[PDB]
């Protein structure tokens, strides 16, 4: 009997899979994977003073807001892509069909 | 204050595990098989409902 006791978190970690790396992008709604954490959003530059030991940032609601890339030590802001409700203003279909 | 506090509590409820293994849906989706991922999402869905 041989047992493996991996521990998983939202952490950069040290042991990783054999998957290859890919260049990053800025100011475009993309889905990203950082050391096992998957999220869709816009990647922007950071003015946050990240401490050297720190890796991520969390907001008041405890959500990932900034991340430090493992391959290149830079801090990037995550901003979820734009969304919002849609309303349709129309008169009666009897009067017209324009909306 | 009542309105703001109710909204804050509703937002904070998203961080509860609700008996699952992780409070974030993406990790459950990317870490487990569908037959058990369905159970985990079931727990999260009922809690948030």
């Amino acid at each position: 009997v041989v047992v493996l006791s991996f521990e998983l978190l939202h952490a950069p970690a040290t042991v990783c899979g054999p998957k290859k790396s890919t260049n990053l992008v800025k100011n475009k709604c993309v889905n990203f994977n950082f050391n096992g954490l998957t999220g869709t959003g816009v990647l922007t530059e950071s003015n946050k003073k990240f401490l050297p030991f720190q890796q991520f940032g969390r907001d008041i609601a405890d959500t990932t807001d900034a991340v430090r890339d493992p391959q290149t030590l830079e801090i990037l802001d995550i901003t979820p892509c734009s969304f919002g409700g849609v309303s349709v203003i129309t008169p009666g279909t009897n009067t017209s069909n324009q909306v | 204050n009542h309105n703001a506090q109710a909204l804050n509590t509703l937002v904070k409820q998203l961080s509860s595990k609700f008996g699952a293994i992780s409070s974030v849906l993406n990790d459950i989706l990317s870490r487990l098989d569908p037959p058990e991922a369905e159970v985990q999402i079931d727990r999260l869905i009922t809690g948030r409902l």
Binding site: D59, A61, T63 | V11
Partner: peptide, 28 residues
């Protein structure tokens, strides 16, 4: 009475009431 000097055209008592009563992105 309304105060023409103020851009908001509010009475002094209304202005005081407006001033005396007073994270959003996370909820949004």
């Amino acid at each position: 009475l309304p105060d023409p000097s103020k851009p908001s055209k509010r009475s002094p008592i209304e202005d005081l009431l407006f001033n005396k009563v007073t994270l959003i992105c996370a909820q949004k």
